[model samples]
Target: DPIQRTPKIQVYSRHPAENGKSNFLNCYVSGFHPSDIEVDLLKNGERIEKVEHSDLSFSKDWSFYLLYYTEFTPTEKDEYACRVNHVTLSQPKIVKWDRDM
Candidate 1:
């Protein structure tokens, strides 16, 4: 069943600034039970913080947004992923901040 199966959650930088600051990390969840859903941010395979859910709306799908402040200063090549239920999905998504082409 899809509910029992862990759904895929991905995290990526939507807009990367050249100053290595002021970037937003976007999280996405697909194919999972909305009632028991969770998302966490990890750096170098270690848990850094857990994302908070927004105010419950009329939407049935599970989705949210998080912004990383410039003070965070995440490197352009840092390894990051979102974990669900304390365990990352089948394939943990990688985060990238490319300033140059």
Candidate 2:
């Protein structure tokens, strides 16, 4: 493992149900090692079953970093979280949603 790196994680929660629309959540994981990371969305301690996820992308150069994201509908009054898994992390890196608090 000559080039080990951890993902930079970001999470967002958006609720449109208050305005009569669909609510959603976004999870972004960037600047990680290529092909060795997993990113997912969680709802109430359970992983989200399906989402429109981005294929892994590169950051350019020989260092070879990558990025990815997931977007899913969010339910009202339900909790959600984002998780990033990689060899560099001692545990899964998580970013919990906090938009509708």
Candidate 3:
């Protein structure tokens, strides 16, 4: 039988505007080959930036964190995610600011 496996990933965002500044985001992954991990930041479905494994070193537990700083002001909406070789695992995490609200 194939190796039964489950990939784990987590994403979170902090809106500093509530306290004072921009938002910070963190992405974590487990159960994935470190060489196959890929991290990206997207704005309105468009790829804005990418973080490579070599650029990010994880702890002994196979976990890493990504930080994003962005002004809380509205800007056509945005999304972010972490993937395995471009294959998205969790969900298309979103960050949106509403001027109307």
Residue-level lDDT tens digits of model 2 in 1-101: 47676677877644443433455666766766655677777888787677676555576642333333344545557777887788778787777777554
Best by lDDT: 2
Please identify model 3 stretches exceeding 4 Å from their true place: 1-6, 14-20, 50-76, 86-101
Candidate 1 stretches greater than 4 Å from native: 1-6, 17-19, 57-71, 86-101
lDDT of 3 by residue, 14-87 (tens): 44323344655444444543334454544555664533332445457654433333323323434444333323
Q: lDDT (CA) for every model shown?
A: 0.48, 0.64, 0.42
In terms of TM-score, the best-performing candidate is: 2
Backbone clash count for every predicted candidate, in the order shown = 0, 0, 0
For each candidate, give its TM-score against the true structure.
0.52, 0.71, 0.42
Model 2 worst lDDT run, 10 consecutive residues = 61-70
Q: Candidate 1 — which pairs collide?
A: none
* Between candidates 2 and 3, the TM-score winner: 2
Better of 1 and 2 by lDDT: 2
Report how far off residue 16 is in candidate 1 (Å): 3.5
Model 2 regions lying over 4 Å from their true place: 13-20, 61-76
* TM-score computed on alpha carbons, candidate 2: 0.71
